[PDB]
């Protein structure tokens, strides 16, 4: 499994593979548990809000993270990710698996989805 083949999977499958430590070939670092719990508490905090309100609040952290990556069209990429992925899994890529997230964003830039 390469980084690009992995970034091509849904966030929930990338994260599922991370936790099932048969990781003899998974280009993912060991997640920090204080970070994993802060992200899960954050997502817990959004349960019960309007879908629209949940994507805006997560989008805030997500857009800031894509702008660090150096990619143009980070709003459009941010919206597309929020509409195409599991919110909780995406936040785990954002805070814990940033390089996979970047490989996934390059896949979308390749589809002209930032334009």
């Amino acid at each position: 499994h390469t980084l690009s083949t992995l970034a091509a999977l849904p966030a929930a499958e990338i994260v599922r593979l991370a936790n099932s430590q048969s990781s003899s070939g998974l280009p993912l670092p060991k997640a920090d548990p204080a970070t994993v719990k802060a992200t899960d508490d954050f997502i817990d905090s959004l349960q019960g809000k309007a879908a629209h309100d949940q994507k805006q609040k997560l989008g805030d952290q997500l857009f800031k993270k894509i702008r660090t990556f150096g990619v143009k069209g980070a709003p459009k990429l941010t919206i597309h990710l929020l509409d195409s992925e599991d919110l909780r899994a995406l936040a785990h890529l954002m805070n814990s698996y940033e390089d996979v997230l970047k490989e996934k964003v390059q896949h979308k830039v390749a589809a002209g989805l930032n334009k």
Binding site: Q56, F63, A74, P75, I79
Partner: peptide, 6 residues
């Protein structure tokens, strides 16, 4: 730059 969900 401001991020907003439509």
């Amino acid at each position: 730059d401001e991020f907003i969900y439509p």
